[PDB]
Design a protein around this ligand. Structure first.
Ligand SMILES: CC(C)N1c2cccc(F)c2C[C@H]1c1cnc[nH]1
Length: 370
């Protein structure tokens, strides 16, 4: 009934509450690099702009509302509701492009990733997003009963121009990103699995020979693993004590395999598997902390999760809105749900942001207390 008028504005403030916290979190932090911050703050600035200037009207217009103090309100209301979503999609596209270029072009791109360069990128997103939003000689006096003239021709070019094409690209480059990351870690993950497999085989073994062969197996696996670069220690020197801690760790391990190999040949089947558990624990304490993903890999994956919500929130709306050109299915029950679903995308960006990024939780708890 009337309980819902406050809920939407309540969730509308959740964008201000959520995104402004991010706006100032990255605003001035020695940990936050300026290249990435610029993009996450203009994205959070579009969300904080649409939650205030466009969000509330959609609720009243949805129940007991019409354009007041002129249709000019219905002019800008349409124009910003496309602008933010065309710019938000295109921003996610550019971060998608930034993440790809950084992972591949390496030193050269870092030289060109000047904060001024990426500042220029954002303004251009606003520029080109304003072109897709501005209609040529076509308007989106008395009350007009605010909706969008569903010109089948224009609508789809804009429907694609706002959501489809930018989302398509950002999906298309991130699938290349995933394949690259999977290729790097592949061989090492072979080894780590082979270690774990032979370990369980050791604990799940009944005779000494089975253990001895399992042990000899992992011995090569560890040596093969010893020559990889673990994910955290990517682009670090072998002068870095972390990269050396990795190596010493597999020396220490190999030795323990050999010592456990002496027990299996001595005929002490039980002592062997016992000592094999000691191998496992040692491996975890030495190695596990380096299998964790690098600092740049976290940012790329976390924005992979963000594209997951831009697709999940907006695709139902745009796909049902695109189908209206052929008018196949029920809009009455679905339009309302999908119009909100796409809209909550702006409030839920800092939600996934702190839910996954380790720097986010601390930046959220330290922004408030100061
Ligand atoms: C105004 C409606 C039709 N919308 C629109 C129009 C053009 C581009 C575009 F990306 C969007 C999103 C969608 C919408 C805005 N607010 C909630 N849903």
């Amino acid at each position: 009934t009337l309980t819902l008028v406050c809920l939407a504005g309540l969730l509308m403030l959740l964008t201000v509450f959520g995104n402004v916290l991010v706006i100032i979190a990255v605003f001035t932090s020695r940990a936050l690099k300026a290249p990435q911050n610029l993009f996450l703050v203009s994205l959070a600035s579009a969300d904080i702009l649409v939650a205030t200037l466009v969000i509330p009207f959609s609720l009243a217009n949805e129940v007991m509302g019409y354009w007041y103090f002129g249709k000019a309100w219905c002019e800008i209301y349409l124009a910003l509701d496309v602008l933010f979503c065309t710019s938000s999609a295109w921003h996610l596209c550019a971060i998608s492009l930034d993440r790809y270029w950084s992972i591949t072009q390496a030193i050269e791109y870092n030289l060109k990733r000047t904060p001024r360069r990426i500042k220029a990128i954002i303004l251009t997103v606003w520029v080109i997003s304003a072109v897709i939003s501005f209609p040529p000689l076509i308007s989106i006096p008395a009350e007009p009963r605010c909706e969008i003239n569903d010109q089948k021709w224009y609508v789809i070019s804009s429907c694609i121009g706002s959501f489809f094409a930018p989302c398509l690209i950002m999906i298309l480059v991130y699938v290349r990103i995933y394949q690259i990351a999977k290729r790097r870690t592949a061989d090492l993950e072979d080894n780590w699995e082979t270690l774990n497999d032979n370990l369980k085989v050791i604990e799940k073994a009944d005779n000494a020979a089975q253990v001895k062969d399992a042990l000899t197996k992992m011995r090569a696996a560890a040596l093969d693993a010893q020559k990889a670069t673990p994910p955290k220690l990517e682009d670090k020197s072998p002068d870095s004590p972390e990269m050396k801690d990795f190596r010493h760790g597999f020396d220490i391990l190999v030795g323990q395999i050999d010592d456990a190999l002496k027990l299996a040949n001595e005929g002490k089947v039980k002592e062997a598997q016992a000592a094999a558990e000691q191998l496992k624990t040692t491996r975890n304490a030495y190695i596990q902390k380096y299998l964790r993903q690098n600092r740049e890999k976290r940012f790329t994956f976390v924005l992979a999760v963000v594209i997951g919500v831009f697709v999940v929130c907006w695709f139902p709306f745009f796909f049902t809105y695109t189908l209206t050109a052929v008018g196949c299915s029920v809009p009455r029950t679905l339009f309302k749900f999908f119009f909100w679903f796409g809209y909550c995308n702006s409030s839920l960006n800092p939600v996934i942001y702190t839910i996954f990024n380790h720097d986010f939780r601390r930046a959220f708890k330290k922004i408030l207390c100061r």
